[PDB]
Paper text:
For human peptidyl-prolyl cis/trans isomerase [name], a combination of biophysical experimental techniques has elucidated general principles of the energy landscape during catalysis. Here, we use directed evolution to identify mutations that rescue the catalytic activity of [name] [name]. We measure the effect of the mutations kinetically, using NMR, and structurally, using room-temperature X-ray crystallography and multiconformer modeling.
A second round of ~1500 variants in the background of [name]/[name] [name] identified an additional mutation ([name]) with a further increase in activity. Our data show that the [name]/[name] and [name]/[name]/[name] mutations increase kcat/KM relative to [name] by 3-fold and 5-fold, respectively. To reveal the structural basis of the increased dynamics in the group-I residues and hence increased catalysis along the evolutionary trajectory, we collected room-temperature X-ray data for [name]/[name]/[name]. Alternate conformations were identified using qFit27 and the final multiconformer model was obtained after subsequent manual adjustments and occupancy refinement. A swap of the major/minor states from WT to [name]/[name]/[name] is observed for the group-I residues, thereby directly delivering the atomic structures of the conformations for which we measured their interconversion rate by NMR. Both the [name] and [name] mutations subtly reduce the amino acid size, and combined partially restore the “Phe113-in” conformation as a minor conformation that can now be directly observed in the electron density. The interpretation of increased conformational heterogeneity of Phe113 and Thr99 was additionally confirmed by an alternative ensemble refinement method. Here, the increased dynamics can be rationalized by the ability of Phe113, which directly abuts the substrate, to transition between different rotameric states. This transition is controlled by the repacking of alternative conformations of core residues, such as Thr99, and is enabled by the decreased bulk of the mutated residues (Cys>Ser; Ile>Val).
Author numbering: 1 to 165
The structure:
C-alpha cells in the first residue's frame, strides 16, 4: 500500500517543456486520490491527456483539469459530475501542493490547483490530496507563461500523462 505516483509531460505551444510527477496521498484521501489517478491514466475512457492549464497566476497557482471545456467551466469526476469533500486533514503548506478546485461545498470534479506559494486561506475549503515529487522546476518554468489575470501567453498542455508506480 504505497502511494501512487503519476506524471504529466507538459508542452508549451506543442513544444516539450518537461515532466512533473506527483505523489497522491491515497492513504489519507483515497477517494480523491483515486479520481486524479484514474483521470491521469485515462483508464475509465476520459481524462487529462491533451487538456490545458487554462489559468496560471504567478506567485499563486497553476490551474488545470477542465478536459471538457478548456476554460474552467467543465470537467467531471470518475464518480459523476461532482463528489463530496472527503476530508481536510492536509493543509496548504507551501509550493507544490495539489489541491482540488471547486465552486462550493461538495462540488469536486476534475479541476485542480498546483500551488506555487503558501495558500493557507484555502485550508478547510479545498481538499489537498497530493504534492509535486519531481519537476517542481518545470512548474516554475510554467508559471512564467501566466499573468496577473491568469491568462496564459502560450498554450500549456498535458501532452502525456500516466502512472509511474
Amino acid at each position: 500500500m504505497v502511494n501512487p505516483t503519476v506524471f504529466f509531460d507538459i508542452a508549451v505551444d506543442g513544444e516539450p517543456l518537461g515532466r512533473v510527477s506527483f505523489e497522491l496521498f491515497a492513504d489519507k484521501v483515497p477517494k480523491t486520490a483515486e479520481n486524479f489517478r484514474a483521470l491521469s491514466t485515462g483508464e475509465k475512457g476520459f481524462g487529462y491527456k491533451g487538456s490545458c492549464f487554462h489559468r496560471i497566476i504567478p506567485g499563486f497557482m497553476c490551474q488545470g483539469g477542465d478536459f471538457t471545456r478548456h476554460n474552467g467551466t467543465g470537467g467531471k469526476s470518475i464518480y459523476g459530475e461532482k463528489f463530496e469533500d472527503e476530508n481536510f486533514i492536509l493543509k496548504h503548506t507551501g509550493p507544490g501542493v495539489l489541491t482540488m478546485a471547486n465552486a462550493g461545498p461538495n462540488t469536486n470534479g476534475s479541476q485542480f490547483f498546483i500551488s506555487t506559494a503558501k495558500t493557507e486561506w484555502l485550508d478547510g475549503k479545498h481538499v489537498v490530496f497530493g504534492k509535486v515529487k519531481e519537476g517542481m522546476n518545470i512548474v516554475e518554468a510554467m508559471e512564467r507563461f501566466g499573468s496577473r489575470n491568469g491568462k496564459t501567453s502560450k498554450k500549456i498542455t498535458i501532452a502525456d500523462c500516466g502512472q509511474l508506480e
